[PDB]
Structure formats: C-alpha cells, structure tokens
Design brief:
Blueprint lengths: L12 H4 L12 E2 L5 E2 L6 E4 L5 E6 L4 E5 L7 E4 L6 E10 L10 E2 L6 E9 L5 H4 L6 E10 L7 H6 L9 E3 L15 E6 L10 E6 L3 E3 L1 H7 L30 E2 L3
Parallel strand pairs: 1-8, 2-15, 10-13, 10-14
Antiparallel strand pairs: 3-6, 4-5, 4-11, 5-7, 6-7, 7-9, 9-10, 12-13, 12-15
Bound molecules: ligand 5DU, sodium ion and zinc ion (ZN).
PDB class: lyase
Keywords: drug design, carbonic anhydrase, benzenesulfonamide, metal-binding, lyase-lyase inhibitor complex, lyase
Assembly: monomeric
Length: about 260
C-alpha cells in the first residue's frame, strides 16, 4: 500500500491516485516575497475553549489526536473562511533530522515538523461529505522548529510509547489544543489538497507564519514511533512528509505585511 518509503513513497502515489498530479495539490513552497498581502482577509477565529479530545491513534502513517466533532465545540472560522469548520483531529509530519520534516516550506526552508489541525465545514454535515467538496476542509498548519520545549506538547509526547506500532490507540482526554498555538495568528492561505492519498482537492490551507518551538527531546520521541504493526520488523516512523508540489495557477495570500 502507499507510504513514505523508496518503493511506495510520494513519487509512486499518482499510479493509484491520479489526482496526485492535479491542479491544486499540497503542500507547496511559500515564497514570502510573492505572497499577495490581502487587507480584506479577516483575523483567524480559533475557538478551542470547549474542545473534547477523545483518543490518540497510530495509523501507520502518523499519529492522530481525535476530537468529538458531533457539536460545535472546537471550531475555526473567520480568516479566509466563510463557514464554520469543526476540529476533527490533529496530527504531525516530521523528519529523521531536525533540518527536514515539514510539508510546506517557506522560501525553500524546511522546518523539523508541521502540525495539521484538520477541520470540516459544518454545512456538509460530516467529514466524509466535506472531503468531496472544494471548500470542505480547513487545515491550520503550524511549523515546529527545534529550540525550547513546548510545554503544551508534552502530554502528547508522553503517551507515544503506548501507541508505538500501527493500529495502537489510547484514551486521550482533556487535551487542550490551544497549548500548541504560537503567539501570532498571522497566516498565509491558498486552495490545496490533502497531503496523503486520497489527495482530494478539498482543503483551504491556512499556514501560520510564526513557528512553535519544541525541544530536541520532544521531536526525538516522535522518531521512536513505528510505521509497522506490533510483531512486524521495525521501521521507524520518520520522514512522513510529502514534498512541495507545483503551485500551478494559484496565488498564496498573506494576512500580514
Ligand atoms: N496532511 S492531511 O491533512 O492530508 C493527513 C495526513 F497527511 C495524514 F498522514 C493523515 S494520517 C491518516 C492517513 O490515512 C491524516 F489523517 C490526514 N488528514 C485526515 C483528514 C481526514 C482524512 C481523510 C483522508 C486522508 C487523510 C485525512
Ligand atoms: Na535541546
Ligand atoms: Zn497532514
């Protein structure tokens, strides 16, 4: 099946998922000089006060923290969005080395990891309907750089040894995603796609300008996870990022400067 290795990694995905070569694929390199400042873009509204995290799961590609999205408890709106989007899950992509790991790049610079908070447009009623729509998802992307620890990340890092292998899950209640945000909500935005198969072109991407900093020990703990299931040979879960895709007929808009 698809993955991140030599024989099934991103350069192979188009054979099963032809939209891999589509018109609005993600991620992309953000050229900060050519992003258009749009003064009509609104501040982002991140309303995470009533978030209910449920569980954390190793799916063999990354780990996901899942939320109760059956009511408007943790929503994203404003910014470039017209609707209300509900938080369903977050996950990360990261590298084998601190110099790589993010999906988006900024002037060709890679970060050590990238957090994706995935939300779906509540006019479509559920996540599965939303992914079939050009405006169905809004994914808030936050870069991680290695420096000082992120205290709000530590509850995540601490539970990872309990979901080491493909298919494992653990209860993960009372996790507050506001702990993962940087100080500024200035952002870039562009229309794009999921960054794994099925690569559907249903995403409004909102990528925060300001990274969060995490410690070397925090990111090292991510690289101890495994892509394989228990009692299969060990394949460390590292480098689970898709490279930048061509921007094609798209413009990245900036909410700042
Ligand atoms: N960067 S992303 O938002 O495209 C993404 C990833 F890159 C992931 F690696 C994963 S791990 C599960 C893969 O099947 C994601 F869930 C999601 N997001 C979820 C969003 C729900 C969904 C549906 C189909 C595929 C992926 C996803
Ligand atoms: Na350190
Ligand atoms: Zn992602």
């Amino acid at each position: 099946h698809w993955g991140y290795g030599k024989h099934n990694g991103p350069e192979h995905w188009h054979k099963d998922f032809p939209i891999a070569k589509g018109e609005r694929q993600s991620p992309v390199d953000i050229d900060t000089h050519t992003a258009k400042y749009d003064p009509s873009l609104k501040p982002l509204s991140v309303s995470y006060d009533q978030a209910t995290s449920l569980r954390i799961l190793n799916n063999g590609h990354a780990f996901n923290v899942e939320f109760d999205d059956s009511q408007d408890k943790a929503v994203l709106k404003g910014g470039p969005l017209d609707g209300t989007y509900r938080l369903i899950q977050f996950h990360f992509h990261w590298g084998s080395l601190d110099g790589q790991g993010s999906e988006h790049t900024v002037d060709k610079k890679k970060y050590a990891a990238e957090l994706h908070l995935v939300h779906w447009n509540t006019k479509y009623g559920d996540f599965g309907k939303a992914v079939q729509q050009p405006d169905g998802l809004a994914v808030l992307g936050i870069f991680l750089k290695v420096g000082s620890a992120k205290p709000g990340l530590q509850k995540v890092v601490d539970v990872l040894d309990s979901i080491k292998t493909k298919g494992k899950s653990a209860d993960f209640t009372n996790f507050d995603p506001r702990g993962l945000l940087p100080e500024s909500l200035d952002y870039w935005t562009y229309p794009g796609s999921l960054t794994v198969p099925p690569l559907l072109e249903c995403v409004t991407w909102i990528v925060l300008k300001e990274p969060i900093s995490v410690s070397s020990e925090q990111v090292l703990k991510f690289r101890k996870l495994n892509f394989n299931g228990e009692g299969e040979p060990e394949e460390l879960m590292v480098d689970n990022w898709r490279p930048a895709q061509p921007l094609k007929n798209r413009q990245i808009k900036a909410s700042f400067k």
